Ligand binder design. Sequence first.
Ligand SMILES: OC[C@H]1O[C@@H](O[C@H]2[C@H](O)[C@@H](O)[C@H](O[C@H]3[C@H](O)[C@@H](O)[C@@H](O)O[C@@H]3CO)O[C@@H]2CO)[C@H](O)[C@@H](O)[C@@H]1O
Ligand SMILES: [Ca+2]
Length: 318
Amino acid sequence: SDLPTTWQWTSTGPLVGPKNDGRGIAGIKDPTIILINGTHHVFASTAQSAGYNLVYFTFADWADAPNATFYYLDQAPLGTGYRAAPQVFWFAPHKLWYLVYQNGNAAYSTNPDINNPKGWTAPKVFYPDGMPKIIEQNIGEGYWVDMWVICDSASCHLFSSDDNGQLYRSETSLEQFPNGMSQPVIAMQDNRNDLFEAACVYSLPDGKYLLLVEAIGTDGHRWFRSWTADSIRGPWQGLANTEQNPWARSNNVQFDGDVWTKSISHGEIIRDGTVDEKLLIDPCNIRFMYQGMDPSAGGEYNALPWRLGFIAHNNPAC
Ligand SMILES: OC[C@H]1O[C@@H](O[C@H]2[C@H](O)[C@@H](O)[C@H](O[C@H]3[C@H](O)[C@@H](O)[C@@H](O)O[C@@H]3CO)O[C@@H]2CO)[C@H](O)[C@@H](O)[C@@H]1O
Ligand SMILES: [Ca+2]
């Protein structure tokens, strides 16, 4: 509607990477990002071969991202252990910020003040009885990953992937959230590489919804596919979801300076304005914080040199 069926982008250079601070982190990854009156708030995965946890950092101008201080959330009650792939939003019924992420289950922490990285609660889980049978049945050799909540004015939905080609969806009422999530349905299914992980589900000003999912291309590089729908529940119609017409991929991203990555991987659209549980974006002014890496690098996945930049949407349709 106010979305083009073809997409073009401009990318920054790699702005955010690990600090030389003794933690040994290899990759900074999987950002969630919101913008409040000039100030960006970011949460990201820390990745290395010993494990994953979470970091917070903030900055106004993008040029200040590289020197932004890292506030590691293992200093909060959120703590040490496995945590990855965060999502932040204000949950207006509770007047608390939620941070959704994975820990082997689907988890959340809350905090009344986004500026306090020490304030994030120890995790609670959306599935207190463990991994749903449907996921156990279909996961194969995959991993349960990349949790995402979006609500409308009646219901809150929790999406997740299995790195095996399923996208799962559970729901509960707005009034019960975070409790009472249903056993998931398979919301969408494809071969592994075509519907792999890193979903985002957004609302649009015209009342429709946008689904982005990360995929692994025939060249082995990460890219994003897209769909729209009239309902969070689907059905989903292709938007830009092929290699020749991608949402974001090496063939529709132009670099300012060097071409520092071929993969366009796990990211989020910068949500400004309301930063609440409706996950509204402005289709006229899309910017996407994403992860990339030197396309010549290899080795163990967990020690890959992931860095964060942004792509800015060049051909807005409004
Ligand atoms: O494209 C490189 C490589 O990707 C592999 O997928 C990665 C996924 O992107 C990643 O989500 C997953 O990460 C898990 C990790 O391997 C585990 O050690 C565990 O502790 O947690 C992570 C899940 O949160 O890893 C896989 C593989 O490492 C594809 O599997 C592979 O085919 C592909 O070449
Ligand atoms: Ca994410």
